[PDB]
């Protein structure tokens, strides 16, 4: 039952690394430029 009976799980478009990169960008922006980068 590796894929059960016609039931397929799809991956996300943004990988965990890409989400981590967005979080890093948000943290670097807030820390180094505060409220101005938004």
């Amino acid at each position: 039952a590796q894929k059960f009976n016609g039931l397929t799980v799809l991956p996300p478009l943004l990988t965990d690394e890409m989400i981590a990169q967005y979080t890093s960008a948000l943290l670097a922006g807030t820390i180094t430029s505060g409220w101005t980068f938004g």
Binding site: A1, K3, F4, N5, G6
Partner: protein, 49 residues
């Protein structure tokens, strides 16, 4: 059924002829002549985009 048969690492009691997973589908059989336990893997499938 339809599937791919492979050598199993499962240990069956001599009574049991096949097994099932938590969702009650068959995933292993005992060959009726050799008594070897074989795992059943569904044949590959998926969507096409």
């Amino acid at each position: 059924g339809t599937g791919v048969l492979t050598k199993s690492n499962k240990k069956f009691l001599p009574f049991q002829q096949f097994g099932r997973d938590i969702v009650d589908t068959t995933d292993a059989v005992r060959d009726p002549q050799t008594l070897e336990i074989l795992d059943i893997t569904p044949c590959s499938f998926g969507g096409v985009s």
